[PDB]
Design a protein around this ligand. Structure first.
Ligand SMILES: Nc1ncnc2c1ncn2[C@@H]1O[C@H](COP(=O)(O)OP(=O)(O)OP(=O)(O)O)[C@@H](O)[C@H]1O
Ligand SMILES: Nc1ncnc2c1ncn2[C@@H]1O[C@H](COP(=O)(O)OP(=O)(O)OP(=O)(O)O)[C@@H](O)[C@H]1O
Ligand SMILES: Nc1ncnc2c1ncn2[C@@H]1O[C@H](COP(=O)(O)OP(=O)(O)OP(=O)(O)O)[C@@H](O)[C@H]1O
Ligand SMILES: Nc1ncnc2c1ncn2[C@@H]1O[C@H](COP(=O)(O)OP(=O)(O)OP(=O)(O)O)[C@@H](O)[C@H]1O
Ligand SMILES: Nc1ncnc2c1ncn2[C@@H]1O[C@H](COP(=O)(O)OP(=O)(O)OP(=O)(O)O)[C@@H](O)[C@H]1O
Ligand SMILES: Nc1ncnc2c1ncn2[C@@H]1O[C@H](COP(=O)(O)OP(=O)(O)OP(=O)(O)O)[C@@H](O)[C@H]1O
Lengths: 152, 152, 152, 152, 152, 152
């Protein structure tokens, strides 16, 4: 049957780094569900992501009212969690999360992709800090999300 | 030196990880003092922690009015500080703490135990986050503390 | 991409760690190729490994002469490389290898699974050394391989 | 031409570890500019630092109202950013910051010095925690900042 | 359990780093055994190490032929293994070894001490590379071993 | 003080990674001395390196009968050692070496540059592994060093 992955994240905003994982994931799984686990306005926080990922048929976006990531996956039929690692810090953090998730839902596998080097230093928090000071970070954001980020 | 050890921590709440450390420490030192160093409240912790440790004759619990850990050790006559390391992050954090403590009190030794891998991913804050969303983490808490915790 | 994966290694011997990654990989990929790159005999390894993974319809074992992993993958039709990470040292080593493979074959994706904590300390070279001295590591090897190991 | 370095930091307060970096980079660069990228009014944080660095002719202090570090460097003709690394956490954090600053200002080079061992565990944050509790960290502070510090 | 500890190593040669751990260990255990697992001949090494530790009455030196550390401990009545950590590399290495030893002998506890900063960078191998080139590392070797070492 | 830096390394072969550090530090130092510590032939090494660094005025190539690095630097007038860090492994390794060099020659400063993204996974040895199997690493070597490597 279909191999379905949930890609949980804060995504405020979604960056080219997230998008890169989504593009690579879309080749690995039959379906990728982007889970916006809820600073931004979801109604369009989800719209931005949908816009940014429109050229990929097997990807969709979902808002999830706060709950355990695994319970969200279960109710979606996702047997796979997909996560990214950009450095040692992510690794140790994602490792604990994935063990906890394994304890909570042993049937769900967490799968890892490493950041592509162009984006290994990119995170939304660093990006927001640079923009808050006028720095040009357009090369790290999807055009539409960059457009929208300006209005803030 | 006298084989007396202080095990300082928040224990908010105490996990099986802490407990594991205490059990192993009880085998090494003549006395193990658990120092609850004050959102679960102080008087509460103590009773719970005593309740969970009652089967170890050489373990006892004290509430320590906020102060330097090494001054608290001196008062109690503890010559050893017991810490646990579960990953690189703890290692670097505990290492700086131990160096500062050695500057403040060179006669006091910091001793380290590594997490027993069933609990390497376990911390009170991760447990708290998982409980918030209804996760079952009873395998990670002493029964007494789990129940008392289900009053949320 | 076609869900065809290569899991490259020397597997001398294969451990429950490798087996564990193969089992989890088998839930995701249509085809998991165990690529044994040529201390037993080639024909013996293949037999041991096929025997240890016979319960999995979508796993195959293929002996390969040493060469570029991505050349092996391309010969066999694999679009994915499966790697495991048991600690920081593996992470940093695997990341360099993955980036190099990305340079050599951009169309091949390296996918990562984290060691299941019971085997996180296990590698063939720690096992060998323990075996050299009569240590009981039967918990860490497929029973067919552990038997074979004693024999010689 | 002159090699000029900006040394950005919150210096809250400046410690002997900072002072050690400043002294060492004062030998490496023709000029070093300490940038207090904003307790005691920074109107005095600048004086504290100025006082502490008096015996070094090629060192200046400026308060850059918060702005992109590289923008500050550019407007001062500083083609070098000087950073310290105490540990792995520092390394990964500074590395992301240097990669972003490279993207923002490719002509500016980030240069790193390792902490000298007596100060490797020293942070303003740790010092403040110890000071809060009465601990003696006078060895970790320039005399003038220590004095100016025991008043709140 | 009996506060008897084994401190296993090659001690080729024994460094002030080693000596530092032994001194600190002699304060914690009733008996510390330096297990020297076979530059110098066994008899020389034993004399060297005995000479270097003769100031500590609860320290003893035993030569041991290479074998499982935990069975050497079992033969000698040691319930504790004492190990040092000087960096992340050491931590990950000792962690795997401690987990294996725990699997081989669950009743044996491995206890860790962090390197004292002066010696954090000190290993026998590095010390030897510096020695072969004439560099003065006398500050890093007990005098008797230093003297002995500069006679060949 | 005039700023002259020694860049010690094996350089078999020199990569675009090394070249990258040389270009960057040539902008920081009055003189950069490439110290080839002598499988490759030195006359070769030197000519290859000198040719790959032809159009940098303040860059000089030298080979050292091997001796302590800080001795070779003192001989040359180099008050600075320049190193690169690609990852955590490099960092811990270079940190030990730098501390040992601080101890041997406290007057000599070790200065660090972080690898830039394109080359952070590149090392001579990983390169050789790949070359030795016909992989294309021409993007990672200076063109002359690349042609000269065809023959072997
Ligand atoms: N640039 C990137 N490259 C690869 N993976 C990434 C990147 N950014 C985030 N990820 C991974 O995507 C997942 C979701 O990240 P998420 O947006 O929740 O946190 P984050 O990027 O740290 O955001 P913030 O900085 O706002 O905390 C995580 O596994 C994260 O490690
Ligand atoms: N599961 C565990 N296994 C081994 N050691 C642990 C474990 N949890 C905590 N420790 C160690 O025991 C001591 C108690 O620490 P403390 O309870 O303050 O931290 P913590 O559990 O990380 O708390 P929090 O997550 O609430 O910040 C610390 O030295 C910590 O590293
Ligand atoms: N116990 C384990 N858990 C998870 N992943 C593992 C485990 N052992 C090996 N791997 C991963 O599987 C792949 C094959 O590993 P490899 O062939 O190097 O075996 P190894 O046991 O590390 O070998 P050796 O110890 O002999 O060098 C690598 O990506 C490795 O990191
Ligand atoms: N003891 C030290 N030795 C060497 N470098 C240091 C030391 N303390 C800080 N630095 C470096 O100096 C720069 C400025 O540090 P800064 O004061 O901004 O942060 P910090 O020291 O972490 O302060 P805080 O603890 O308040 O966050 C950073 O690059 C930091 O790594
Ligand atoms: N300077 C030091 N400070 C603290 N611990 C140390 C130091 N040197 C070694 N140790 C620890 O003491 C134990 C014995 O180590 P070992 O005999 O391997 O010494 P070593 O110097 O690492 O030897 P080698 O250079 O051959 O690896 C190990 O656990 C090691 O990590
Ligand atoms: N690609 C790179 N980017 C940045 N720094 C580098 C790079 N390659 C090497 N260096 C640094 O340059 C210095 C010289 O390194 P060295 O001669 O050991 O080359 P190496 O590539 O590590 O060799 P090998 O991998 O064959 O052992 C070291 O400090 C190393 O960390």
């Amino acid at each position: 049957m279909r191999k379905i992955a949930l890609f949980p994240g804060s995504f405020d905003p979604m960056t080219n780094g997230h998008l890169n994982l989504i593009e690579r994931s879309a080749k690995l799984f039959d379906e990728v569900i982007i889970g916006v686990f809820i600073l931004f306005t979801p109604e369009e926080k989800k719209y931005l992501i949908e816009e940014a990922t429109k050229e990929m048929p097997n990807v969709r976006v979902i808002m999830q009212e706060t709950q355990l990531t695994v319970e969200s996956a279960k109710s979606l039929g996702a047997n796979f969690l997909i996560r990214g690692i950009r450095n040692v810090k992510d690794y140790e953090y994602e490792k604990d999360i994935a063990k906890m998730n394994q304890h909570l839902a042993p049937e769900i596998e967490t799968v890892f992709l490493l950041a592509e080097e162009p984006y290994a230093h990119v995170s939304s928090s660093l990006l927001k800090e640079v923009l808050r000071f006028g720095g040009d970070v357009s090369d790290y954001l999807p055009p539409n999300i960059y457009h929208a980020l300006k209005q803030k």
